[PDB]
Short mmCIF file of C-alpha atoms and ligand atoms in Angstrom, two decimals:
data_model
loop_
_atom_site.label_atom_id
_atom_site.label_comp_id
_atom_site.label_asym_id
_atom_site.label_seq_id
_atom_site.Cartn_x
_atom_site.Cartn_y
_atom_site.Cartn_z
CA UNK A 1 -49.45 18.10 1.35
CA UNK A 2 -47.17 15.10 1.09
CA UNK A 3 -46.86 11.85 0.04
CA UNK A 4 -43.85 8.84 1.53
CA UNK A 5 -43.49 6.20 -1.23
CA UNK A 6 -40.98 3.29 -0.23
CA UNK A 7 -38.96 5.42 1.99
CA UNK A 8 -39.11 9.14 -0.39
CA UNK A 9 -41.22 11.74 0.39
CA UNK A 10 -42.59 13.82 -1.99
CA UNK A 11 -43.90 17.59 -2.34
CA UNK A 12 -47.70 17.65 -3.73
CA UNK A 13 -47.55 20.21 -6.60
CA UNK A 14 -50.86 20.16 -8.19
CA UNK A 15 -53.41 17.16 -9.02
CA UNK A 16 -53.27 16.19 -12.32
CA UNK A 17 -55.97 14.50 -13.23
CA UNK A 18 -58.82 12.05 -11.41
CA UNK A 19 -61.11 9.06 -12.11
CA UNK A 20 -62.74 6.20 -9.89
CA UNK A 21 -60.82 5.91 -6.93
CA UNK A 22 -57.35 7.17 -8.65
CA UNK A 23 -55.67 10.65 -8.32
CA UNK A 24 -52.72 12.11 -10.54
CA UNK A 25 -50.19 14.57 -8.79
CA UNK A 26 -47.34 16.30 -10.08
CA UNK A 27 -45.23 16.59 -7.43
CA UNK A 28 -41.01 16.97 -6.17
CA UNK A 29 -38.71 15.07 -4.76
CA UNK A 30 -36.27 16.63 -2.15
CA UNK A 31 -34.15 17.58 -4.53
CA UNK A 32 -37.02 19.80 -6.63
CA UNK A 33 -37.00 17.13 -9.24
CA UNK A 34 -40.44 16.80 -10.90
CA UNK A 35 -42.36 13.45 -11.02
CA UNK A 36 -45.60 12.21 -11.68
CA UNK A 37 -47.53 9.79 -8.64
CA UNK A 38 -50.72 7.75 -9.12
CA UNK A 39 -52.52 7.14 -6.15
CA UNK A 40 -55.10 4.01 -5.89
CA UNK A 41 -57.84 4.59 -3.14
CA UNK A 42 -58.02 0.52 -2.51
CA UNK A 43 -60.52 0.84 0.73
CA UNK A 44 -62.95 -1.02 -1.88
CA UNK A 45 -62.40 -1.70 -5.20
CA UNK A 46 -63.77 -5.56 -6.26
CA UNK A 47 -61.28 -7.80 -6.97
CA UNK A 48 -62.08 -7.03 -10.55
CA UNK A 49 -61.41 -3.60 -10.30
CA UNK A 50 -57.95 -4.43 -8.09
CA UNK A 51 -56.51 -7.45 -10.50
CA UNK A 52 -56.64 -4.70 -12.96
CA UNK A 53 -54.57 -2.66 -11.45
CA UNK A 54 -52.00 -5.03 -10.73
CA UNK A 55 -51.91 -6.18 -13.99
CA UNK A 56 -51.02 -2.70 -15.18
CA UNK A 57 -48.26 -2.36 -12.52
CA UNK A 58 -46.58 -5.71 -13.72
CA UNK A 59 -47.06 -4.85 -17.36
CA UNK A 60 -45.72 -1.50 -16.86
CA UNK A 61 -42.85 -2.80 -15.18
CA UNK A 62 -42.06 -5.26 -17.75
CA UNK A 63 -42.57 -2.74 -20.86
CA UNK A 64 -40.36 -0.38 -19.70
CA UNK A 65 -37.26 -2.75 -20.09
CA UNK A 66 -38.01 -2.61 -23.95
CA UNK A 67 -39.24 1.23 -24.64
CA UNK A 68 -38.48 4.26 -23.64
CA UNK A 69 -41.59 5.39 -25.40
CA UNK A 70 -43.71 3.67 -22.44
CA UNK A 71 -44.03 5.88 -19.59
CA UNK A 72 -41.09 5.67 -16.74
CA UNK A 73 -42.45 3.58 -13.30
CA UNK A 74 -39.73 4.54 -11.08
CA UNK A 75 -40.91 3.16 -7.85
CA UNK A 76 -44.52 1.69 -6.17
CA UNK A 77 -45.57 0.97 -3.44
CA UNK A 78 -48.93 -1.63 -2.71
CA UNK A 79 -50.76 -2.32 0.21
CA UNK A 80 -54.35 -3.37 0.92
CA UNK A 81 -55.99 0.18 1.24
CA UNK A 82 -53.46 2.11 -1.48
CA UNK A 83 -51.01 2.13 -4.51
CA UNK A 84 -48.84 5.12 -4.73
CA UNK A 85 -46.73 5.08 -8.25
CA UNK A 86 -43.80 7.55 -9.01
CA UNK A 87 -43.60 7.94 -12.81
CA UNK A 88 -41.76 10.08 -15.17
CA UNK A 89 -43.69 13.27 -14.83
CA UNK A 90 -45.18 14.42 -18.67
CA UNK A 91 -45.01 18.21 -20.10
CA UNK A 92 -48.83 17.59 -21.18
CA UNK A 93 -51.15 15.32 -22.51
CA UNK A 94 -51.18 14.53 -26.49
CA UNK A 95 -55.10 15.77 -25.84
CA UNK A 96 -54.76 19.16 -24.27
CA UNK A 97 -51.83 19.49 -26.24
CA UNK A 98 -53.68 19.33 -29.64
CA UNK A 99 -56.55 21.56 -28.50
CA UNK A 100 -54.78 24.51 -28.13
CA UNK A 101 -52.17 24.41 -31.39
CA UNK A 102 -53.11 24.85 -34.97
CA UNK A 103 -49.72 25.13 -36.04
CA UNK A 104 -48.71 21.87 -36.50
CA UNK A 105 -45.00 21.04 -37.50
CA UNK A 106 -45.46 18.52 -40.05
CA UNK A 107 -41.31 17.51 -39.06
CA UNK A 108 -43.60 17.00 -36.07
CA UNK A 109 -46.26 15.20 -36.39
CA UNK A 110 -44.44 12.57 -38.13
CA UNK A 111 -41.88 12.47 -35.37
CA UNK A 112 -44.87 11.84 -33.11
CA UNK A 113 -46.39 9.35 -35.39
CA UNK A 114 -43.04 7.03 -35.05
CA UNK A 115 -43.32 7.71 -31.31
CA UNK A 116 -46.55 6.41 -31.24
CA UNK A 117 -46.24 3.62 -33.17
CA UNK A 118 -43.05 2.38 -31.47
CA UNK A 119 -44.85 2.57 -28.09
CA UNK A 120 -47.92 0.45 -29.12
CA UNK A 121 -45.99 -1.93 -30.98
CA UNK A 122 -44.38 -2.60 -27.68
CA UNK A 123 -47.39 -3.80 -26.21
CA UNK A 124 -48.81 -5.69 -28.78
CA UNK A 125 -45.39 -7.86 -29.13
CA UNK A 126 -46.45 -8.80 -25.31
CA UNK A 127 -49.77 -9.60 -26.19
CA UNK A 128 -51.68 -6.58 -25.06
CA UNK A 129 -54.30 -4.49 -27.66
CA UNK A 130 -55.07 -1.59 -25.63
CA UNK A 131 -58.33 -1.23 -28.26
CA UNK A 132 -59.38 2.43 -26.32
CA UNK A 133 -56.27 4.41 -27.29
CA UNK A 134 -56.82 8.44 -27.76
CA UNK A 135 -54.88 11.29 -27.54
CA UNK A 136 -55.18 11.19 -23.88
CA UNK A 137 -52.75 7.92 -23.59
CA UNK A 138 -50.09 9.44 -24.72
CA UNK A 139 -47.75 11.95 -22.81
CA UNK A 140 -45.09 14.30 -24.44
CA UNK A 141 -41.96 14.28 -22.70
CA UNK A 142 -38.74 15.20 -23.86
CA UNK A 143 -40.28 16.21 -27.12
CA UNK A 144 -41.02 12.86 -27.65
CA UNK A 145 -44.28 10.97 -27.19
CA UNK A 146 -44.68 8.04 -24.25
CA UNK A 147 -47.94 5.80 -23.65
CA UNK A 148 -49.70 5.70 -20.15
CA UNK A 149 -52.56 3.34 -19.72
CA UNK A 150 -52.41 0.44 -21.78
CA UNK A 151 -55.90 -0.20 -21.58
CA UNK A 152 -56.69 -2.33 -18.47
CA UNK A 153 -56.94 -0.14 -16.11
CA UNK A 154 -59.37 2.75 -14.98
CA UNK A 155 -57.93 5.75 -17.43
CA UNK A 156 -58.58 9.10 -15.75
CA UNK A 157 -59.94 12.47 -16.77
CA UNK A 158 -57.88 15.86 -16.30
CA UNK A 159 -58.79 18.04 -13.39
CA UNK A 160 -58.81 21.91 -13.38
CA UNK A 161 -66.58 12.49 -19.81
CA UNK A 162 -64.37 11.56 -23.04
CA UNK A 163 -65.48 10.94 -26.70
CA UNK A 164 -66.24 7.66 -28.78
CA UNK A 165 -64.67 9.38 -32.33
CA UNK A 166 -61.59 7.06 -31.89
CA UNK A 167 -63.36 3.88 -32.18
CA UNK A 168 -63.13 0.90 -34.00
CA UNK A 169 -65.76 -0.39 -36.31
CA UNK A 170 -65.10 -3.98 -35.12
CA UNK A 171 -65.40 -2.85 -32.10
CA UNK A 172 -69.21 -1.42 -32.23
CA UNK A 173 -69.90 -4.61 -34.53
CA UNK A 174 -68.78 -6.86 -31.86
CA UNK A 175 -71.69 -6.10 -29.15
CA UNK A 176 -74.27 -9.23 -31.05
CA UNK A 177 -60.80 -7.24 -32.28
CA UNK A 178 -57.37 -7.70 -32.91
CA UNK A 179 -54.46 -5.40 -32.92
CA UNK A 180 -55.93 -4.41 -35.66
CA UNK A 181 -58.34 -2.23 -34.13
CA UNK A 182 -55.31 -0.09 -32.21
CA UNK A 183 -54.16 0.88 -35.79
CA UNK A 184 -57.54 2.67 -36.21
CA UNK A 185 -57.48 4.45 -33.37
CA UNK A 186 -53.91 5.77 -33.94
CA UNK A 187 -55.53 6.81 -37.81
CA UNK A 188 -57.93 8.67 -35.81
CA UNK A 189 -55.33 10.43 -33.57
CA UNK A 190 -53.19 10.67 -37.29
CA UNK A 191 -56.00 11.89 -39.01
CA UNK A 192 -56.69 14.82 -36.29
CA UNK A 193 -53.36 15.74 -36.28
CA UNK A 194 -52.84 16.01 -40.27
CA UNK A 195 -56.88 17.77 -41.02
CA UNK A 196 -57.14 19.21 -37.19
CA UNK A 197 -60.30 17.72 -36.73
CA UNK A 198 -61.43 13.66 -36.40
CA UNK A 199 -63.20 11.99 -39.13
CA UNK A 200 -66.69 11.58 -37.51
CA UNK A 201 -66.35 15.23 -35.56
CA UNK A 202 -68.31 16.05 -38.20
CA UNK A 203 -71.54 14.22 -36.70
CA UNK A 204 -72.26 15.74 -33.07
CA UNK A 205 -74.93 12.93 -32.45
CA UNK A 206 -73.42 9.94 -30.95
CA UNK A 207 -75.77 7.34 -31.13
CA UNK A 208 -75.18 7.75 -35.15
CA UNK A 209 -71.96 8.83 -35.26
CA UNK A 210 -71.45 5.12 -34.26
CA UNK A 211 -73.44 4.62 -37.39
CA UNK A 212 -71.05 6.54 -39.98
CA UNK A 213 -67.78 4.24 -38.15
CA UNK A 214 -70.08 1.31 -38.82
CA UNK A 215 -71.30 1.56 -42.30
CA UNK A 216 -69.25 0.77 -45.24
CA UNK A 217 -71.19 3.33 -48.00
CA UNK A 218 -69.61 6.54 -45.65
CA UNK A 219 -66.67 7.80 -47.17
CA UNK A 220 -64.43 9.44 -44.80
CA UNK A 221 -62.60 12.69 -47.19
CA UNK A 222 -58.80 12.72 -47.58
CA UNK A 223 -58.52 16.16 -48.80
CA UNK A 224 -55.18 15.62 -50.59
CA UNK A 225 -52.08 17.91 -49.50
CA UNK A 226 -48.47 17.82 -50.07
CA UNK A 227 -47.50 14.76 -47.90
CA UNK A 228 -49.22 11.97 -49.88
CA UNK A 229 -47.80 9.48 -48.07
CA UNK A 230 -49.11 10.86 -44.89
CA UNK A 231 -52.45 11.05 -47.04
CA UNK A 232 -51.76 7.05 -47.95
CA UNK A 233 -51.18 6.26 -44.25
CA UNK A 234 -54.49 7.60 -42.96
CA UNK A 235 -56.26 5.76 -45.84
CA UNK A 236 -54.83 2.24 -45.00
CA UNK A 237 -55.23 3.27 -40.70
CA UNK A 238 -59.29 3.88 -41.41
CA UNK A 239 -60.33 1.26 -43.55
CA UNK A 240 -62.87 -0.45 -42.20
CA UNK A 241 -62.27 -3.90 -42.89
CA UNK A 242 -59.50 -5.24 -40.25
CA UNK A 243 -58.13 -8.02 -42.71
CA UNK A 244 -58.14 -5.06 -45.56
CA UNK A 245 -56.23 -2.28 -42.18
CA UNK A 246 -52.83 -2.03 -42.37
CA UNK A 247 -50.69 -3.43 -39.60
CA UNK A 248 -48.34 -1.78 -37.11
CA UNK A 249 -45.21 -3.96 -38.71
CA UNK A 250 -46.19 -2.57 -42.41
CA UNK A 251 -46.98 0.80 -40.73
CA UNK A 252 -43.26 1.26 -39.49
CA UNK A 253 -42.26 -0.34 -43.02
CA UNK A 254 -44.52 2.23 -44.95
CA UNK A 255 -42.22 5.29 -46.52
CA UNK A 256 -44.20 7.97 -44.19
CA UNK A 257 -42.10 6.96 -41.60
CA UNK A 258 -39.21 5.65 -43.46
CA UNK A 259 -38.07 8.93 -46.00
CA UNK A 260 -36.89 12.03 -44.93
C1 FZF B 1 -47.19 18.69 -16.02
O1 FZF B 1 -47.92 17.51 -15.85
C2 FZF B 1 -49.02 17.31 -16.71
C3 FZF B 1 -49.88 18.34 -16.99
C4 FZF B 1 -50.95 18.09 -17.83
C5 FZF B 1 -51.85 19.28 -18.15
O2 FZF B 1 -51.45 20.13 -18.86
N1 FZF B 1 -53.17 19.37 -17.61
C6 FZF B 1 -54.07 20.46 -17.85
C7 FZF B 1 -55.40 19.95 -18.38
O3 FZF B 1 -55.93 18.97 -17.50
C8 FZF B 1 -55.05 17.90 -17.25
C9 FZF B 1 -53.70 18.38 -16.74
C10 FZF B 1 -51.18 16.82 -18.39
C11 FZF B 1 -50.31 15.79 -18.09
C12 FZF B 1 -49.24 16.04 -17.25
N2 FZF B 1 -48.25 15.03 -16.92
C13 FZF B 1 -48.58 13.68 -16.59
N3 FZF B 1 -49.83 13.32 -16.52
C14 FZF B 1 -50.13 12.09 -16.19
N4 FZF B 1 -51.53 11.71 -16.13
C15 FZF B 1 -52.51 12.62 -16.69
C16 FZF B 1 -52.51 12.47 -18.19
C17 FZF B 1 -53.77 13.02 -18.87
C18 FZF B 1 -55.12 12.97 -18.13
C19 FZF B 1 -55.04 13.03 -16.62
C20 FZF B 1 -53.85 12.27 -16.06
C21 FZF B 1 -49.09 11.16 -15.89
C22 FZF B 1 -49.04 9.81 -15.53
C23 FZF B 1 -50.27 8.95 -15.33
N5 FZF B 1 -51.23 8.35 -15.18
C24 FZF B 1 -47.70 9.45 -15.41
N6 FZF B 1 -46.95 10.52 -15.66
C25 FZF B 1 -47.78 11.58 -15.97
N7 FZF B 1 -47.57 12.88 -16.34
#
């Protein structure tokens, strides 16, 4: 299996992951470089659905100028039946990664917590809250961490369903969100990565484990450890008021990131 992209061909490795009308390929140049390449089945997709994807091809273009923690778009190529993008291939997901460590560097996880934070500051300084971000977004490369989807388009599922603990309460509360709401979702991801489990992973029934991220009187548990700070980080990420959450530009000012 092959794949031509705006003159290049391409070796199909393996398929990374799927979703809609989207498939994920690691794959080599002719020079057995490794790359990543998204491929849009367009043959119908309502305009809806295609505007999306455009809009994450120009914003991905556009990021990349100003982070190296956003994903690598090398080349595309658009047409009115397919889109065929060659990325900067990733080691591994952030999610499969964390699934099968325990041992946790904490040197690590706050080098990854910078990483993070860098990337989705990006996008919200071009007006984009991604508002659905999970371990799953994020791609370590390098030993470093890099963003994928920012949100508007179709995100995909690994190929050999997803989970709702990463969400905002303004974001259930809002069905009768500001970049606020990203800052949770990283405390989630934080939060996991410092207790190895999510807050609410506790309650295995959805429709009320939406309850415990809604109500106030539900006191997530900061077991305290050595890194306080990192202890004082998740507490200002999962607060549940958004004018009382701490904000990306205090986040990269807070001394978790800044000592040591
Ligand atoms: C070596 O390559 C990877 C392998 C794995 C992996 O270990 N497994 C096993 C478990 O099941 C999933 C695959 C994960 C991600 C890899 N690298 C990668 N993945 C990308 N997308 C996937 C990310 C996560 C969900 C499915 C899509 C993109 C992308 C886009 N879009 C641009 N560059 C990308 N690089």
């Amino acid at each position: 299996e092959c794949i031509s992209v705006k003159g290049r061909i391409y070796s199909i490795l393996k398929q990374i992951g799927s979703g809609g009308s989207s498939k994920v390929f690691q794959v080599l140049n002719e020079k057995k470089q490794i790359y990543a390449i998204k491929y849009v089945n367009l043959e119908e997709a309502d305009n809806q659905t295609l505007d999306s994807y455009r809009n994450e091809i120009a914003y991905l273009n556009k990021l990349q100028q100003h982070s190296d923690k956003i994903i690598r778009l090398y080349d595309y190529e658009i047409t009115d039946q397919y889109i065929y993008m060659v990325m900067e291939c990733g080691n591994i997901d952030l999610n499969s990664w964390l699934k099968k460590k325990k041992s946790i560097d904490p040197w690590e996880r706050k080098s990854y917590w910078k990483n993070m934070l860098e990337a989705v500051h990006t996008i919200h300084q071009h007006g984009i809250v991604h508002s659905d971000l999970k371990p799953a977004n994020f791609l370590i490369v390098d030993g470093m961490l890099k963003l994928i989807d920012f949100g508007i388009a179709n995100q995909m599922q690994p190929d050999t369903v997803g989970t709702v603990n990463y969400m905002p309460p303004e974001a259930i509360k809002d069905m009768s969100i500001s970049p606020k709401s990203d800052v949770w979702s990283l405390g989630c991801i934080l939060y996991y990565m410092t207790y190895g489990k999510t807050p609410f992973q506790q309650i295995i029934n959805q429709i009320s484990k939406l309850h415990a991220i809604i109500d106030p009187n539900h006191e997530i548990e900061f077991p305290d450890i050595p890194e306080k700070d990192l202890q004082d980080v998740l507490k200002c990420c999962l607060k549940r008021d958004p004018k009382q959450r701490i904000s990306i530009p205090e986040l990269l000012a807070h001394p978790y990131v800044q000592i040591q």
